[PDB]
């Protein structure tokens, strides 16, 4: 502490006074992760090996829940072409719990993959399929001229060619009503300025690179507003209470001491918060008790020293910290309302204040 | 005895002192509330972005938090100085009355 106060006062000699330093913290003793008792595997195998992908104008969305997922295989697989994430880190998918999982299946021209990204533009991104501005997830695509494209022409992958207005994120339309693009109103099934809203991809193995069909999968999910349903391949470890640990509940990281909670959580409630709007109570995914959360004590470290020439002995104060914390060095310990004190000899007989301490305590140098 | 009753009469007779403690609580409550805001970022939990994004993509997102959060302290701390100066002037007035 003498060297610390010298460093923080920027001098090789410090006057007789009390100076703050870097605040005390309790390091986490260990790391614990809490995940639900889920073991069945997510159907990503069938999602990414589905034989038939729906036409983009009628793109198929499939929900995936209550399963165990491993996106590392998809990330490391060289069979894929463009795995671009927008809201999360691709390697960080595998240590997070997701509330809901969307699988979007549709095949576009390879030159049109760039338009799938959030905030893009184009006829496909307008009235075939689109993403919101705040898309959370990743996009993955790969060429499929080997199977989807046919020598006679894979024209079955239809798509909308006309639309009155740009639709909304995650919105689909199926009706093939004749478009009245022209000034005159129209009906029937054909006519000038009466155009069918659909036109079809022409896919053959003979076409050059970029024009071939790409099997595109878009992954959408939301974090921290709903109970976890899909979790990563992390393995749960035994819970440790009332100790400073690097806890992890369904991806909700933190640092503090975990204690049993007397707050009555309704079955649908799992995340508890305070007037500060920050997590303070979580229901363990393994067993349904309520665990109070509190960061274990941190306080200022106010060195109490006399003049450097007068002495080198120093008394270390921990502001607002109960003595049931750090030991000695870095049999003589005192407790004050202002915090715990180390390196001083508490006495009963009183004198005038020399170094203010807190809650009416004052230090002095004497035999 | 009237001082006994006048003090006992209304609970708002100590408004000159009550407003002081209220305001620091108000400023702190306002300062604490700021941590719940996003400042344009994808979230408001500094631990979330660290787990949600990699080293090279999150480094700009925490920069969004670090601007607003730090700027709040400037607004909070400065607003504490003027109040501190206000009290200091009042204390000197009290000392003269003392």
């Amino acid at each position: 502490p003498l060297s610390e106060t010298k460093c923080t006062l920027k001098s090789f000699t410090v006057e007789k006074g009390i100076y703050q330093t870097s605040n005390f913290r309790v390091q986490p003793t260990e790391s614990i992760v809490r995940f639900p008792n889920i073991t069945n595997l997510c159907p990503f195998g069938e999602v990414f090996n589905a034989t038939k992908f729906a036409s983009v104008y009628a793109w198929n969305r499939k929900r995936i829940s209550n399963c165990v997922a491993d996106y590392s295989v998809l990330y490391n697989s060289a069979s894929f072409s463009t795995f671009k994430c927008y809201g999360v880190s691709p390697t960080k998918l595998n240590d997070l719990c997701f509330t809901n999982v969307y699988a979007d299946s549709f095949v576009i021209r390879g030159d049109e993959v760039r338009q799938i990204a959030p905030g893009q533009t184009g006829k496909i991104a307008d009235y075939n399929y689109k993403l919101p501005d705040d898309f959370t997830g990743c996009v993955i695509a790969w060429n499929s001229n080997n199977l989807d494209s046919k020598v006679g022409g894979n024209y079955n992958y239809l798509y909308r060619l006309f639309r009155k207005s740009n639709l909304k994120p995650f919105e689909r339309d199926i009706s093939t009503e004749i478009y009245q693009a022209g000034s005159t109103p129209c009906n029937g099934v054909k006519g000038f300025n009466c155009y069918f809203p659909l036109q079809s991809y022409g896919f053959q193995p003979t076409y050059g690179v970029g024009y071939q069909p790409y099997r595109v999968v878009v992954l959408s999910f939301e974090l921290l507003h709903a109970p976890a349903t899909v979790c990563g391949p992390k393995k749960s470890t035994n819970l440790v209470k009332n100790k400073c640990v690097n806890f992890n509940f369904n991806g909700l990281t933190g640092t503090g001491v975990l204690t049993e909670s007397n707050k009555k959580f309704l079955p649908f409630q799992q995340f508890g918060r305070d007037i500060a709007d920050t997590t303070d109570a979580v229901r363990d995914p393994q067993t349904l008790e309520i665990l109070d959360i509190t960061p274990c004590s941190f306080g200022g470290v106010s060195v109490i020293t006399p003049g450097t020439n007068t002495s080198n002995q120093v008394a270390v104060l921990y502001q607002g910290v109960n003595c049931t914390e750090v030991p000695v060095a870095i049999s003589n310990v005192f407790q004050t309302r202002a915090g715990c004190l180390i390196g001083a000899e508490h006495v009963n007989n009183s004198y005038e204040c020399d170094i203010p301490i807190g809650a009416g305590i004052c230090a002095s140098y004497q035999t | 005895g009237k001082i006994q009753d006048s003090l006992s009469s209304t609970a708002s007779a100590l408004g000159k002192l009550q407003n002081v403690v209220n305001q620091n609580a108000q400023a702190l409550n306002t300062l604490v509330k700021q941590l719940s805001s996003n400042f344009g970022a994808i979230s408001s939990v500094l631990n979330d972005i660290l787990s949600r994004l990699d080293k090279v993509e999150a480094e700009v997102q925490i920069d969004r938090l670090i601007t607003g959060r730090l700027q709040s302290l400037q607004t909070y701390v400065t607003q504490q100085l003027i109040r501190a100066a206000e009290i200091r002037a009042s204390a000197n007035l009290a000392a003269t009355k003392m």
């Binding site: 500060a276 920050t278 509190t294 960061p295 306080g299 200022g300 502001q319 607002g320 309302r337 202002a338 203010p356 301490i357 807190g358 809650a359 009416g360 | 702190l28 300062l31 604490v32 941590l35 003392m98």
Partner: peptide, 28 residues
């Protein structure tokens, strides 16, 4: 809890009460 701390004042409620008693004692 998030770095917010309240450090107790150096003078305790008892001493300042004694100060006021001392101030009043000399006054009367």
């Amino acid at each position: 809890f998030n770095g917010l701390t309240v450090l107790p004042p150096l003078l305790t409620d008892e001493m300042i009460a004694q100060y006021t008693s001392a101030l009043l004692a000399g006054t009367i």
